[PDB]
Every structure is written in structure tokens, then in C-alpha cells.
Design a protein around this ligand. Structure first.
Ligand code: HEM
Ligand code: HEM
Ligand code: HEM
Ligand code: HEM
Lengths: 132, 141, 141, 132
């Protein structure tokens, strides 16, 4: 939502290191195992779809000042076509944070995580936009 | 937490945490205070600066309580009976805060044990934390 | 649900619901479908028009299951064992939907029993529904 | 959020019958009993504060096309002064719906409730505005 210049630079710099395929695959995979009801909506295709999710998150990270417009279409897709309850957007977001923590270890400091929690909340709220 | 497979995973994962339980509890608390500023309101008496001896001390307690729980997966309500009075009756902690701390603990375990923090283990640990949180908000039962 | 005081309230409140359990279950379903359109996706095989014989029939089943639960507050996991397989394993119902249906059931009870639906009873019934929902999503345990 | 002309008229017409004191008192009272952690933030003053909550809801019901602006100040009050987690806004909203159901009985039809659920969601989201 609202980040300082310093936070924004740390966020962007970590994203330069994110392999969207490997992170995407792992994040979707953990969602399905940790939260088994999501199996209603979804193996080599976990990878393929995981990659598309992360590529979309990447778009958010590069358009932090207009998350609503960026995810407008995706919001309708998830609401009227798929009927995904928006609580699950928040769940996927936190799973992505856990995955980034696993991949980056000690570089994923308490401060950097706090910034990513803002971003993930921003993204989930933009996807919920045309529901509620 | 409750399925035999889950208990086995939890006890196994916690053996890898070992004597770091206290350190991880303290780091999970710092991640929560930074990430979710709303939580800070429950600690008006703490010095909440990084490296605080109070947060360090309190993390150790939180760590010891979890290590206790893992030894008593059979009777969580009895082992943590005193803690549920404190959290739900005396402090009136909003149940949402338990989800936030649990997320921050899983994040901390991911940071320090990337090879052991597999999807199977992540899943079992989430159930464990959820089951502990239930007990601690049990006054709302 | 689990405290003696809560069980007493639940059994008492349900004695006032009586043979209307089926009717209220059906109305609670209509309130849920209208109020929360997301839920309709789980019933592609139902005619979801007001007065539907399918919704009426299904409300009765939901009503009978709750009346069963109230008779077995001691062993909810055992009494509803089959239902948890259906809901969490076969259907994969998102746990949020249980909160929505529970709200709609409480709304329906308020409509029909305004004098009996006291704050004390409302509280005990919310715990009851929460405890049933836990059992039915127990595969996520 | 978005209601038809027919829904809006039914919503407004029911609000003409709402005693903000008696509904307000009862809604706050039930919140405290059903969700006991809210006792951290709060008897004859349950009545007095209940009345202020309902008066604020009333303002939302009369300004459905601009909920964000209507509750801007109240959003900051609940976030930075009180530190109320926004999940509780959704809880209070559903408790108010249960109270209206109790007061209006069979006139509170499934259709009218569905409209009020939109309004309560709109209000909760406007109060969460400056958090997330
Ligand atoms: C919260 C972050 C999420 C993002 C950024 C995201 C993004 C996307 C994208 C970009 C697509 C395909 C877009 C296209 O048409 O090219 C998609 C499709 C889809 N999403 Fe999501 N999604 C998210 C969460 C979820 C969740 C939690 C679920 C529920 C399980 C879900 C269910 C689906 C389904 C079923 C499809 C259609 C997939 C297919 O046809 O292969 N999404 N999503
Ligand atoms: C995994 C869940 C949690 C565990 C295992 C846990 C553990 C504990 C323990 C063992 C104590 C007692 C310290 C002692 O007397 O020796 C304590 C106290 C306390 N807890 Fe928790 N806690 C949890 C969640 C929370 C949450 C979510 C909050 C609020 C954000 C919180 C706030 C407090 C506060 C304010 C105290 C009192 C500290 C003091 O007396 O100085 N706890 N906790
Ligand atoms: C209070 C919680 C609930 C109770 C007591 C309950 C009760 C039941 C019962 C007894 C059945 C079996 C019908 C039979 O085989 O005789 C059933 C089936 C079913 N339930 Fe639930 N239910 C609850 C919540 C939910 C929720 C939240 C959803 C999704 C929105 C849902 C969706 C379904 C579906 C799709 C079926 C299958 C219906 C069919 O086979 O035609 N239920 N439920
Ligand atoms: C969701 C609907 C809610 C609305 C519309 C609402 C509205 C209001 C209003 C209008 C005031 C006083 C404004 C003034 O300064 O004149 C207030 C104060 C306050 N609210 Fe809320 N509120 C809501 C929910 C909550 C919840 C869920 C809590 C948490 C328990 C809460 C906690 C408080 C507290 C502690 C005060 C200060 C009261 C005092 O000083 O007497 N509110 N609210």
C-alpha cells in the first residue's frame, strides 16, 4: 500500500532474485497440502500454474501504486467464474511469504518480511476488490 | 497435531529445533511486532527494541511452552491449562493474534531449517499450532 | 458446546426448536444461497428456487444431523464421523462456508424464536455450531 | 456496495423502524457475550456506546455511494488509537444482522437479509480502509 523509499528498494531488490517457476511451484504445492480444501480448484501443472501465480504477483510488486487496476480482471475471474472465497487470497499470500523465507534464509530479515506482508495484503485486497 | 501421522511429524520436527526453541520464539515475536503492529498493544510493559532482554526472555518462555506441548500432544488442555486462563480470561487476547504469531513462527522455522521444513512438516506444524491456539483461547470454547 | 453450562443451554434451546429443526435448516440454506452467492457452487445438482423440494429435503437432513449432534455432545467426532468424510474428504468444502451457514442458522433462529434467543443462548449456540463445524472439517484437523 | 433501486428502498424502509438505542444496546451487549475478547475494549454505557455505533451505521445506510469517505476518520480512530483488528468489524456487522432478525421477525426475509449483508460488508470494509 504505502511503503517508504527504502522499503520499496529492498522489496524490488529481493524480487530480482526470485525464480518465479521454482517459487511458484513450491507455493502452490504447499497451499494444496497445508490447506487441502484448495484441492477442489486444482502436478507438472502445479508447476505451470504456480508460475502464472508468481508472474502475476511480480506485476503487483512493480505496480504498487495501483494494485486495484492491475488485478481488476483477475478479481472478476476469481469471483464470478471460479467462486473462490477471498480468505484464500490471504492464505496463498502468507504461504508465499513462508516460501520466500525458506529460499532466502537470514537475508529475509524481520524488517523485509514486514514489507512483504504489506505487499501480500495489498495484493489480496486488490483481488477481493469486486466481491464485497 | 491429533492424527498419528501428524504427531509423529511434530515430534520429529521439534527434535530438529532442539535447544533453539527459545531463540526462534524470540525471533518469531520480533517478526510479529514488525509485521503486525496491532499486536504490540498487548505488551505495553516491554521494551520492544531488537535485542531486548525482555523479548529474549519472553521468547524463551514461549519456546519452553511449545516444547512442553509437543511432549503432551495427548492432553494439550491439561498441560496448558494455566496458560489458557492467562490468555483468554486475564488478557482477553483476540484469537486472530494467535494466527499471526503462528504464521511468524512458521516463517522463523523456514528461515533456520530450510531443508527440514518440507511441505509434509509444514502441514503438521500448522495443525499443531492451530490446536495449541484453540487450547489457549479455550475460555471462548 | 463443551462446558457443562453450554451443553445445558444447547439442549434447552434445541428443545424449543423441536420438530421445526427441518424447516429452519431449509430456511437457513435459502438465506445462505441469497446472502452469500459463493456457496451455491457446491449444489450444481439442486434446484435452488425458493420452495424447492430439494432444498426442503436437504434442510430436513441438515436439521436431523444437528438434532443428532445435540444428543451426543459428549462424542461429536463419533456421531458425525461419516459426515466429516463427505464434507472434508469427498466435497472439499472450504471451512469459511461453515461460518456462513452457522450465521444463517442463528439468523433463522432469531427470526422464529425471538423470546428464547437470549444473549446467553446465542452464545452457547455459536459455540455449538463452531464445534460441529470443527468436526465436519476434521479431515483438515 | 452496489444495490438495485428496489433493494435500496427496502433497506431504507426498514431503517425508518430501527430504534438506534435499543438495537445499539442489544448488538453491543451480544458482541461482548458471544465474543468475550471484545470485553478488552469495553453497562448503562453499553447502551450509550451501542447507540453511537448504530447512529454511525445509520450514516452508512444513508451514504451507500461513498462509504470510504463517510468512515475515513472512524477508520483512523479504530486503527491507530484503539488497535482493533478489522476482523471484529465483520463480527459486529453480523451480530447487528442477527439483532435485526430478532426485532423484525418474518419481515426480515431472506432477500432483505441478503441486502443487509452487502451493507454490513461495505461498512466493515470502509472501516478497515486505513489498515491493510
Ligand atoms: C492470491 C493470489 C492469486 C493470484 C495472484 C492468482 C492469479 C491467477 C492467474 C494469473 C490466473 C490465470 C490468468 C489467465 O487467465 O491468464 C489464475 C487462474 C486460476 N486461479 Fe488464481 N491466483 C491467486 C489465488 C488463487 C486461489 C487462492 C485460488 C483457489 C484455489 C485460485 C484459483 C484459480 C483457478 C481454479 C484458476 C483457473 C486455472 C486454470 O484454468 O488452469 N487462485 N489465477
Ligand atoms: C503459540 C501461542 C502462544 C504461546 C505458546 C504463548 C506462551 C506464553 C507463556 C508461556 C506465557 C507466560 C509467561 C510466564 O508466566 O512464564 C505467556 C504470557 C503472555 N502472552 Fe502468550 N503465548 C502465545 C500467544 C500469545 C499471543 C498471540 C499474544 C498477543 C499478541 C500473547 C501475549 C502474551 C502476554 C501479554 C503475556 C504476559 C507476559 C507477561 O506477563 O509479561 N501470547 N505466553
Ligand atoms: C452445520 C454444518 C452442516 C451440517 C450439519 C451439514 C449436514 C449435511 C448432511 C447430514 C448431509 C448428508 C445428506 C445425506 O446423505 O443424507 C450433507 C451433505 C452435503 N452438504 Fe452439508 N452440512 C453442513 C455444512 C455444509 C456446508 C457449509 C456446505 C457447503 C456450502 C455443505 C454442502 C453439502 C453438500 C454439497 C452435500 C451433498 C448433498 C447431496 O448429496 O445431494 N454442507 N450435509
Ligand atoms: C464495525 C462497526 C463499528 C462502528 C460503526 C463503530 C463506531 C464507533 C464510533 C462512532 C465511535 C465514537 C466516535 C466519536 O468519537 O464520536 C467508536 C468508538 C470506539 N470503538 Fe467503535 N465501531 C465499530 C466497531 C468496533 C469494534 C468491533 C470495536 C472493538 C471492540 C470498537 C471499539 C471502540 C472503542 C474502544 C471506542 C472508544 C469508545 C469510548 O471512548 O467510549 N468499535 N466506534
Amino acid at each position: 500500500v504505502q511503503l517508504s523509499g527504502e522499503e520499496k528498494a529492498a522489496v524490488l531488490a529481493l524480487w530480482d532474485k526470485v525464480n518465479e517457476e521454482e517459487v511458484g511451484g513450491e507455493a502452490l504445492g504447499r497451499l494444496l497440502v497445508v490447506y487441502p480444501w484448495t484441492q477442489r480448484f486444482f502436478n507438472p501443472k502445479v508447476k505451470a500454474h504456480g508460475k502464472k501465480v508468481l508472474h502475476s504477483f511480480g506485476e503487483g510488486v512493480h505496480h504498487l501504486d495501483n494494485l486495484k487496476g492491475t488485478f481488476a480482471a483477475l478479481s472478476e475471474l476469481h469471483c464470478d467464474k471460479l467462486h473462490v472465497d477471498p480468505e484464500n487470497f490471504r492464505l496463498l499470500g502468507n504461504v508465499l511469504v513462508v516460501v520466500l523465507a525458506r529460499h532466502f534464509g537470514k537475508d529475509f530479515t524481520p524488517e523485509l518480511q514486514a514489507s512483504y506482508q504489506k505487499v501480500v495484503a495489498g495484493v489480496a485486497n486488490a483481488l477481493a476488490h469486486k466481491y464485497h | 497435531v491429533l492424527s498419528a501421522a501428524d504427531k509423529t511429524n511434530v515430534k520429529a520436527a521439534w527434535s530438529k529445533v532442539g535447544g533453539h526453541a527459545g531463540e526462534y520464539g524470540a525471533e518469531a515475536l520480533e517478526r510479529m511486532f514488525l509485521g503486525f503492529p496491532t499486536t504490540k498493544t498487548y505488551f505495553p510493559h516491554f521494551d520492544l527494541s531488537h535485542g531486548s532482554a525482555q523479548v529474549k526472555a519472553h521468547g524463551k518462555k514461549v519456546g519452553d511452552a511449545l516444547t512442553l506441548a509437543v511432549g503432551h500432544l495427548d492432553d494439550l488442555p491439561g498441560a496448558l491449562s494455566d496458560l489458557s486462563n492467562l490468555h483468554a480470561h486475564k488478557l482477553r487476547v483476540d484469537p486472530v493474534n494467535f494466527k499471526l504469531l503462528s504464521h511468524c513462527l512458521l516463517s522463523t522455522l523456514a528461515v533456520h531449517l530450510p531443508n527440514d521444513f518440507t511441505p509434509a512438516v509444514h502441514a503438521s506444524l500448522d495443525k499443531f499450532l492451530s490446536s495449541v491456539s484453540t487450547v489457549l483461547t479455550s475460555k471462548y470454547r
